[PDB]
């Protein structure tokens, strides 16, 4: 794993440092100043990406070449953070994270990893807002489910009636209802079911 803490570092310096770290030979045409703080440790992929993002911001692209050569051609603090996501696909968040960066101005970037973590590079304020949203959606797709059997009333009927005003599904086999929520919600929904029964 890897780490980055640069404060008004000359671009050439920055490039050389990341190069040695990644075991990559670097070529340059390249003026600029770099600043970034790693909030979390990064693996080789994520670190490489951070390097690619910061260059892009400064107006530069990488061209990967023959035997591993690369050619280059408080709320305001520039930070990078990796956010693991546990209960939902990272790409299901892309639309609303695109909405978020559209209200945030330029310089901020959301990258998605095939291992299902999101990496955020940008200003601490923006990066905090992106973290909040991700964590909120990820926690929402984790709602514990409960089966509630009914002695008297009909399973289908109760589900239809409640679902008309609001997830609630029936299973006529066992005359039961499945309720998908959290301890606050499920406790209130249970009593309503019992009372209907």
């Amino acid at each position, epitope marked *: 794993t890897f780490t980055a803490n640069f404060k008004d570092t000359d671009l050439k310096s920055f490039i050389e440092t990341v190069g040695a770290n990644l075991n990559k030979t670097i070529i340059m045409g390249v003026q600029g100043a770099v600043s970034i703080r790693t909030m979390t440790p990064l693996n080789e*992929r*994520q670190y*490489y*990406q951070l390097f*690619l993002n910061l260059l*892009e911001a400064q107006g530069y*692209a*990488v061209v*990967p070449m023959e035997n591993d050569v690369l050619k280059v051609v408080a709320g305001d603090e520039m930070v990078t953070k990796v956010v693991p996501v546990r209960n939902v696909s990272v790409r299901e968040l*892309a*639309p*609303i994270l*695109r*909405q978020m960066i559209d209200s945030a101005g330029s310089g901020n*970037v*959301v*990258n*998605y*990893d*095939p291992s299902n973590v999101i*990496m955020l590079t940008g200003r601490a304020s923006v990066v905090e807002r992106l973290t909040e949203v991700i964590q909120r959606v990820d926690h929402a797709g984790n709602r514990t489910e409960e089966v509630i059997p009914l002695d008297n009333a009909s399973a289908s009927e109760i589900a239809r009636v409640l679902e008309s005003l609001t997830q609630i599904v029936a299973d006529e086999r066992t005359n039961s209802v499945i309720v998908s929520g959290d301890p606050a919600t499920r406790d209130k929904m249970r009593r309503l079911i019992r009372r209907l029964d």
Partner: nanobody, 120 residues
Framework: QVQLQESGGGLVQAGGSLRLSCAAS????????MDWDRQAPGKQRELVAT???????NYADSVKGRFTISRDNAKNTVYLQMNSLKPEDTAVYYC??????????????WGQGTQVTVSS
């Protein structure tokens, strides 16, 4: 990097039709998926339709049958044919390119958007 330019929006009566166009440029080789999403003021931006680089297509429940996404690689352009339009479809439509980076992650690039309005 990839750069995207939308067009084709406008005002249309319910039941009418529009064709959105989006011309991509830059690192076309990195694009591994292109999608259209839309956003009305006060609501979540949501995904409408997607076309992968292999040509697979995805459609949101609300638009399936009415909307067709398509592609013309000679012009590097993807289209959204919007038939049987309802007021519900009034939104700014964005064209978004999902690309692969040299690092192996993915990144979105998208455009300023084209506004669609559907009157009753």
């Amino acid at each position: 990097q990839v750069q995207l330019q939308e067009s084709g929006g406008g005002l249309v009566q319910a039941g009418g039709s529009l064709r959105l166009s989006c011309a991509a440029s830059g690192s076309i080789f990195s694009i591994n998926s292109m999608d259209w999403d839309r956003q009305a003021p006060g609501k979540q931006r949501e995904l409408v339709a997607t076309i992968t680089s292999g040509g697979s297509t995805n459609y949101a429940d609300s638009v399936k049958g009415r909307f067709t996404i398509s592609r013309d690689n000679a012009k590097n352009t993807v289209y959204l044919q919007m038939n049987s339009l309802k007021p519900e479809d009034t939104a700014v439509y964005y064209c978004n390119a999902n690309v692969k980076t040299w690092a192996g992650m993915t990144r979105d690039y998208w455009g300023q958007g084209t506004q669609v309005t559907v009157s009753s």
